[PDB]
Each structure stands twice: as C-alpha cells, then as structure tokens.
Design an enzyme around this catalytic site. Structure first.
Site, PDB file in Angstrom:
ATOM      1  CG  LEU D  38      -2.468   1.326   6.147  1.00  0.00           C
ATOM      2  CD1 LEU D  38      -1.867   1.902   7.272  1.00  0.00           C
ATOM      3  CD2 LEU D  38      -3.823   2.046   5.512  1.00  0.00           C
ATOM      4  CG  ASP D  39       1.092   3.169  -0.929  1.00  0.00           C
ATOM      5  OD1 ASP D  39       0.899   2.498  -1.726  1.00  0.00           O
ATOM      6  OD2 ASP D  39       1.873   4.096  -0.918  1.00  0.00           O
ATOM      7  CB  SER D  40       5.280   2.102   1.390  1.00  0.00           C
ATOM      8  OG  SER D  40       5.390   0.724   0.921  1.00  0.00           O
ATOM      9  CG  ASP D  42      -1.737   4.717   3.389  1.00  0.00           C
ATOM     10  OD1 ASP D  42      -1.897   6.107   3.103  1.00  0.00           O
ATOM     11  OD2 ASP D  42      -2.154   4.074   2.690  1.00  0.00           O
TER      12      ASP D  42
END
Ligand SMILES: CCCCCCCCCCCCCCCCCC(=O)OC[C@H](COP(=O)([O-])OCC(O)COP(=O)([O-])OC[C@@H](COC(=O)CCCCCCCCCCCCCCCCC)OC(=O)CCCCCCCCCCCCCCCCC)OC(=O)CCCCCCCCCCCCCCCCC
Ligand SMILES: CCCCCCCCCCCCCC(=O)SCCNC(=O)CCNC(=O)[C@@H](O)C(C)(C)COP(=O)(O)O
Ligand code: SF4
Ligand code: SF4
Lengths: 208, 113, 114, 82, 176, 96
Positions: D38-40, D42
């Site tokens: 995931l992205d940060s 996210d």
C-alpha cells in the site's frame, strides 16, 4: 542648466546622508548599505534577519519617528540568487521625511512579517505572497488577496508570462465558467526597442 | 492652564506633563544604562534624552516647553518618550550593536544588473 | 547549504505536515461535494486529492514541501469557507478539455508540439 | 470496545471494507507497506477509517507506528481499559 | 494654514438652548431641506433632448478612427508603423509592401476597436496625419467582430467624415 | 433664465439664496465655440546660439546614487531633517 533641468537639493542630500550614517552606526548588525540618490532619497539596505529590529527602530526612535508605512513592495530580479527585493517605504511626519528600507529573499527563505511594527503591512506583504510568492512568517492571515481562487503561480515573477497559462470562458455543456489553457487570437507582439548605443555614461559598468 | 483637548483623537490631555516627562526620561536612562557604553545607540539616545530632560527641567510653562521641545503637543512628546522606552527595552534584547551577521552576495545590491 | 527553514527542520516533520494536510482534505471532501453540490462522487474527489498529493511526491526539499503544505492549507481554507465557487472546485477536473495526444504518432498527426 | 476479540474483528471488518486490501492476505499480522503493498496515504486513510469506527482521534506520532492490524488493536487496547 | 472643521462649542444661554430645542421640536433644518428640494422643483432641468439635442464636444474629441487622404485622393498612410509602436493597447496591426507604382503603402491596417483605449497616441504619433481619431462616437454595433476594423472600414470612415475631420484638424492644429 | 418672477421669487425664497445671480445652467456668458487661431510661444531652448545640448542635458546629469555606507567622537545625534514647523491657524476662516 536652469529651465529644463531639475534643480538639485543639496541640503536634503546632506541631511539624508548624515541620517544614513546615523542609522548605519546605531544598527551595524544588519545595515549592509546606505545610499542616497541624486534626487535625494535615502535607501537603507539591510539583512533580512533584521527586518523587525530596523523597522521598529525607525518607527520608535526619537530622531527617526517613521510612524507611517507608505508602501511595501517586492521586486523580482531573476539574475540574483536572492531574486526578490523587499522594499519598505517609510514616512516620518515629524521630520517631514521619507526613508527606504530594502532587503532580499529567494523563493524558499521566509521573511519575518512586519505587522508587529506596521499593521498597514497586513495586506501589503500578503500581496507580496500573492504576486511574488514570498512567504511571511508569523503573519495573521496570509493567503491570496488579488488573484482568482484557484490561481496557480505568482504573476509578478518575471518568468511568469504576461497572459497567464489559463483563461476562462462560460461553457454551456457543464453550465459553468471553466478554465482552459490560454490561446490568444492575436499574440502579444514583442517589441525589441532598446537602442544599441549607450544612453548614460555615468551608469557604465566595467567590463570583464 | 488646563488645555481642553489635544486635538488628536485618542490622545488625552496629560494633567501633569512635566513630572511625567521627567519620570519617563529617567526611566529611559535607567534602562539605557544596561546597554554597553561603546554602542552608538546608547550614546545618541543618552544625548537626546539628556537634552530633552534639561529642557523639561528648564521650563515651568507647558506651551513654551512645547515650542522648545519641538515635537508638537506635550502629550505626543510623552507618547514618544513611551515609544523610546519600549524601543530601548527591545534594543537590549536584540543587541544590534554587534557586527554584521552576514555579508550580502557580491552583486546583491548592484543596480542596474 | 545552511538555510533558514519555514516550519520543518528535516523531512520527517515535513511528511508529518503533509500527512495532516492529507487528513484534513480527506475529511473535507464529502462536505465539499455536498455544499458545492458537485456532480462527482465522494470517491472521485478523494481520488483527485490523492492525485494532487502524488503529483508532488518527488520532492525531497523540506522548504519546498513546507510551501506545498502552506498552499494546500490555503486551498483548503478557500474550500471550507465558501470562497471558491463550484467552478473553482471543478477546475481540478479538466472536463471541457479534450484529451491530449500521448504517444508519438498522434502528436505527429495533430501538430508540431513535442 | 469491551472485548479484545470484538476489537480485533472490528479492525479486520474496517480493513475488509477498505477495498484496496486483498482479503486473501488480510490477516492480523499482515504488514501494510511491505506485505500488502500500500501507499503511505493508504495507511493514513486506514487510520481515518479506524477513527470513523472507534470514535476517537489518533495523532500522527502514534499512527505512524501502526503498520499491521495487531499494532492497531494493541494501540486501541492500550488507549482503553480492556 | 489649517482650519478646524466641527470645533464649535455651543452656547448655553437660554436663548440658544431654546433655539436648539425649537429646532429639535419644530424641525427647522428638515424644513430647510424641504425648501431646498422645493427650490429645485421649480428650476428648469438640465436635460437635453437626445437624440435631437446633442452634448457639446470640442474639436479635440477622440472618437472613431479614420484613415485620411491627401487633397488629391492619395491616402496619407506611408506604412511607417509609428502608430502601432506607440499604441498602448497594441490595437493596431500593420503589414505593408510596395504597391504597383512603388509607393510605400499598407496592405493590412487593422484597428481592434475593442482593444483600443481611444487615447489618440496614433494620431499624435502619425507624421503625416493619416490615422486620426475623429468625432464619431455613435457607432455601437450588435456583434463583436463589427468592431474589428480593417483598412477598408477605416478608409471608408475617412471618406465618410473627412468634411468634419479636416475642419477639426484645421481648428486644432496650432495647438499641436 | 426664462422663469417668471412669481416662480423666480418662490424659488429664491425656498432656497434661501439669490439663485439668479449664479445660475447652474449656462447661457451666452460662456466662450464662443469658434475661437481665433492661437500663436503659441516657443520655449527657452529655441535659440540659434549658446544653445548646446550638453549645457542643458538633464538626463545626463543624473548620477548613480552616492553610497554612504558599504560593507565592501562625541558627534551630535541627527534627524532626517529639522522637525516640522507647527502649522499656523487660518487667518481667513479658522472656524473659531
Ligand atoms: C397651478 C396649476 C397650473 C397653472 C398654470 C401654471 O402654473 O403654469 C406655469 C407658469 C409658468 O411657470 P414658469 O416655470 O416660471 O414658466 C417658465 C416657462 O419657461 C414659460 O413657458 P414656456 O416659455 O416654456 O412656454 C411654453 C409652455 C407654456 O407653459 C404653459 O402653457 C404652462 C402650462 C399651462 C397649463 O407650453 C408648453 O410647454 C405646453 C405644455 C402643455 C401641457 C402643460 C401642462 C398641462 C396640465 C393640465 C392638463 O407658472 C406661473 O406663471 C406661476 C404660477 C401661477 C399660478 C396661478 C394660479 C393657478
Ligand atoms: C476535490 C479537489 C481537492 C484538491 C486538493 C488539492 C490539495 C493539494 C495539496 C498538495 C500538497 C502536497 O502535495 S504536499 C506533498 C509533498 N511531499 C513530498 O514531496 C514528500 C514525499 N511525500 C510522500 O512520499 C508521501 O506519500 C508521504 C505520505 C508524506 C510519505 O510517504 P512515503 O513514506 O511513501
Ligand atoms: S497611420 Fe501614420 S503612423 Fe500609422 S503607419 Fe500610417 S503613416 Fe505611419
Ligand atoms: S487611440 Fe490609442 S489605443 Fe486606440 S489605436 Fe490609437 S494609439 Fe492605439
């Protein structure tokens, strides 16, 4: 040189040179240059860490009493590494005089807000945020003042184009005023007007 | 003579202007003694405050003191004394008699470019 | 290389401010879609917020991302207080603009732009 | 908020409503960055979904240290009685 | 060298106190205001009967543009582009070439009348009095592009208004 | 000007002022719309001798500003000018 030439005011030139020496020797921590123009206007070029100590001096000192902030200005000069030149214009009503306090910053260094000295500055330096992008630290309400609400870029920067990057029109599909990339039906015609002969030999810069 | 109004809005009449100016000038000098003697601000401010205090001590009349303090109404002379006191209390904390913190770059004040 | 900061001392405080600004935008999006009565979904506006935050993700300078956080707080302040109209909010969605040619061949066909 | 099994099931319910996480890998110890991918941001909107569910504000310094569901349920247990 | 507006301390004798109280109770200054309004009711109004009566203008008036001619039919514009170098709005677009007898003459002389600020720098920059800003001000159009004049429209304004333009220049040129 | 003396007197009574001496409508007292041609004078530099431009060149007497201080005793404290003289109250109409 009587009829068509502006008369020189040597008395005010001597008085402003003396008061420039006065300010330069009271505040040597920040004063970098002091100069007087040939039409007798005093400029005190200071370091940007001393925006508040110089301006509070000139506003409050009994030999200065620059109680009025007439104007606050930035000037974009891209050939300097500190491209923005913050210009304070001050009026002493007591001594019937004007002074100019000049300092500098680039895009990323903040300048301290002078609302603690002149509340008049509250909009002016805010305009300097809007037009030039200079940030002012410890400002009460720093935001845009003149540009449109979704406006990208700082317009009075000299790398910003004359017409912008976007333009508005009403669009009846979305029933909305919309922004689009700018296309001009007639381009602004650029005029190279500068003569190749030297106009003023007094202002000649020495060559390399 | 109990001047009725100062003419300036928000600037009330001072009932005892002489003692007020004397207290503000001695308080300016007492604060200003904490500045080092080599500082030009202390020398100049002591000089002008001693001139003003001697003029205040040399004149019983209020209006003649207004004409020879050369600062308008006596209440704005008092206001300027308060501003000078607040300034000197800030100049002690700022310490601006120190050397220049940073030279500007080589063509920083070169105009025209 | 010793410069005066804006708010952050390094990139960690900077990413903290980026993150709190993202939280504020993420919370604000349903209110913005309601009171501007936008014709987008809440998920579409939140995807636009994620797009506007990922556009500036390549920056490693703390002063530059501090100014990006400051300008994002200014845009958020113009959004929450109804200072923008519906038009200023929908200018993030370039909806009247035709899609630009991306590959070499369509850019060759339409004109001279590289 | 009473029982730790209910808090763990509720954390997992918030994560399985969150559509980007594949439910095949959604476990209690599944890391968000290097496992789930995931992205940060996210993770930030996961924490805001946890604030929507649990109903209290989680600050920045103690939401940066929530990289798995077990850290989240231990944080919520440590900020309550249980 | 200065005066004090509103620094009148009023009298407190019973005469002036009763005068002010009669002004309060009997509305003296309100009847003074009604008297001034009633005074203008019986004045002849300043209204001219437009379109039949016209507002007074001077021969310096800066209205619609016109390209002029010499008193032989030859047009005065020698394609020198001073009017578009001086034009503060960049409303003037000029393109030129030598025509069939070798005269330096324009082929494009456009004025955008919706860029134009009507300041008359073109007629005062013109060395040969070709472009003038004539006396016509009643030239409102129904469409935007009808205010985008080419050389034909401007030469037609010159041929249309020359009998007036030459007399206005005749009345004013010793001030220029 | 064409007002009859009944309405003229009523109007002067209602205004409180003699209105006919100062009419705000303009009549034959104003200048003619056709004027004689002028003969405008020349300036002082319209001379045929002792008129060299280097003796009347204003732009080339502008100097660069004198740098008073640059970072490369018991002297009196100064002000930027003498203090402003107190304004005298109007002899014409001080409202006093
Ligand atoms: C009060 C009731 C009305 C009595 C008549 C009246 O006061 O006439 C204005 C008459 C002229 O006033 P003025 O403004 O000084 O006249 C200057 C005009 O330029 C002098 O007049 P003029 O030079 O402009 O002359 C042309 C003018 C002549 O003016 C008139 O004919 C006056 C209107 C008469 C009705 O005629 C017109 O403009 C034609 C107007 C036609 C319609 C008038 C209204 C009709 C209303 C009833 C239907 O007033 C007086 O003479 C004083 C009042 C007398 C009252 C007497 C008792 C009643
Ligand atoms: C409806 C329309 C609403 C429009 C809203 C527009 C708001 C625009 C706000 C933009 C503010 C920014 O772009 S600040 C971002 C700049 N940050 C950086 O350059 C540092 C890099 N940042 C990151 O990598 C971020 O993902 C994180 C979350 C800070 C850290 O992630 P990394 O770890 O992986
Ligand atoms: S109108 Fe006059 S100024 Fe303009 S190009 Fe023609 S001659 Fe030159
Ligand atoms: S009147 Fe002024 S703006 Fe208009 S065409 Fe002439 S120079 Fe340009």
């Amino acid at each position: 040189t009587r009829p068509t030439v502006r008369p020189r005011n040597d008395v005010a030139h001597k008085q402003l040179s003396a008061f420039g020496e006065y300010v330069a020797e009271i505040l040597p921590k920040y004063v970098q240059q002091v100069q007087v123009s040939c039409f007798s206007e005093l400029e005190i070029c200071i370091h940007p860490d001393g925006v508040i100590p110089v301006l509070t001096f000139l506003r409050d000192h009994s030999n200065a009493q620059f109680k009025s902030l007439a104007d606050l200005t930035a000037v974009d000069i891209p050939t300097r590494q500190n491209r923005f030149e913050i210009v304070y214009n001050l009026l002493s009503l007591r001594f019937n005089s004007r002074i100019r306090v000049k300092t500098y910053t680039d895009e990323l260094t903040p300048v301290e807000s002078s609302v603690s000295v002149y509340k008049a500055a509250n909009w002016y330096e805010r305009e300097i945020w809007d037009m030039f992008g200079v940030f002012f630290a410890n400002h009460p309400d720093l935001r845009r003042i003149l540009t449109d609400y979704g406006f990208e870029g700082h317009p009075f920067r000299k790398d910003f184009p004359l017409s912008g990057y976007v333009e508005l029109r009403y669009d009846d599909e979305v029933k909305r005023v919309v922004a689009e990339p700018v296309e001009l039906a007639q381009e602004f015609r650029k005029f190279d007007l500068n003569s190749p002969w030297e106009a003023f030999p007094a202002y000649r810069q020495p060559p390399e | 003579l109990l001047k009725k109004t100062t003419g300036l809005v928000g600037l009330a009449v001072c009932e005892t202007p002489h003692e007020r100016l004397k207290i503000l000038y001695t308080k300016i000098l007492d604060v200003l003694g904490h500045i080092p003697k080599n500082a030009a601000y202390r020398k100049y401010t002591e000089q002008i405050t001693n001139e003003k205090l001697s003029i205040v001590k040399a004149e019983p009349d209020v209006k003649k003191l207004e004409e020879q303090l050369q600062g308008g109404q006596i209440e704005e002379v008092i206001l300027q004394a308060e501003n000078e006191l607040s300034l000197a209390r800030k100049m002690i904390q700022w310490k601006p008699w120190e050397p220049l913190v940073e030279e500007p770059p080589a063509s920083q004040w070169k105009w025209p470019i | 290389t010793s410069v005066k900061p804006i708010f952050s001392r390094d990139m960690n405080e900077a990413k903290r401010r980026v993150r709190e600004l993202y939280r504020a935008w993420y919370r604000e999006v349903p209110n913005t879609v309601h009171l501007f009565q936008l014709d987008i979904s809440v998920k579409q506006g939140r995807d636009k917020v994620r797009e506007m935050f990922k556009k500036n993700a390549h920056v490693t300078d703390p002063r530059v991302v501090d100014l990006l956080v400051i300008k994002g707080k200014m845009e958020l302040e113009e959004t929450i207080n109804v200072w923008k109209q519906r038009t200023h909010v929908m200018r993030f969605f370039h909806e009247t603009e035709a899609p630009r040619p991306k590959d070499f061949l369509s850019k060759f066909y339409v004109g001279h732009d590289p | 908020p009473l029982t730790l099994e209910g808090i763990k099931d509720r954390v997992l319910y918030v994560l399985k409503l969150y559509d980007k996480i594949d439910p095949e890998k959604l476990s209690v110890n599944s890391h968000f960055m290097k496992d789930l991918g995931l992205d940060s941001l996210d993770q930030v909107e996961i924490i805001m979904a946890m604030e929507d569910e649990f109903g209290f504000e989680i600050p920045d310094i103690d939401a940066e240290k929530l990289m798995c569901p077990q850290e989240i349920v231990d944080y919520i247990a440590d900020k309550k009685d249980v | 060298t200065y005066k004090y507006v509103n620094l009148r301390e009023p009298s407190m004798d019973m005469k002036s106190v009763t005068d002010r109280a009669a002004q309060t109770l009997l509305w003296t200054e309100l009847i003074r205001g009604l008297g001034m309004t009633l005074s203008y009711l019986f004045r002849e109004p300043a209204t001219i009967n437009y379109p039949f009566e016209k507002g007074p203008l001077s021969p310096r008036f800066r209205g619609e543009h016109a390209l002029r001619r010499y008193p032989s039919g030859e047009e005065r514009c020698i394609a020198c582009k001073l009017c578009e170098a001086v034009c503060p709005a960049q409303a003037i677009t000029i393109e030129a070439e030598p025509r069939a007898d070798g005269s330096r003459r324009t082929t494009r002389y456009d004025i955008d009348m919706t860029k134009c600020i009507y300041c008359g720098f073109c007629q005062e920059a013109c060395p040969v009095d070709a472009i003038v800003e004539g006396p016509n001000f009643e030239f409102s159009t129904e469409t935007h592009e009808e205010l985008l004049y080419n050389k034909e429209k401007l030469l037609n304004n010159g041929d249309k208004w020359e009998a007036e333009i030459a007399a206005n220049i005749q009345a004013d040129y010793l001030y220029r | 000007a064409s007002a009859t003396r009944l309405i003229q007197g009523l109007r002067n009574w209602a205004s409180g002022r003699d209105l006919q001496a100062k009419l705000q409508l303009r009549y034959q007292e104003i200048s003619k719309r056709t004027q004689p041609p002028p003969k405008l004078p020349v300036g002082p530099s319209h001379r045929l001798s002792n008129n060299y431009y280097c003796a009347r060149d204003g732009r080339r007497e502008a100097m660069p500003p004198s740098i008073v201080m640059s970072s490369q005793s018991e002297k009196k404290a100064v002000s930027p000018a003498p203090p402003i003289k107190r304004w005298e109250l109007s002899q014409d109409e001080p409202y006093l």
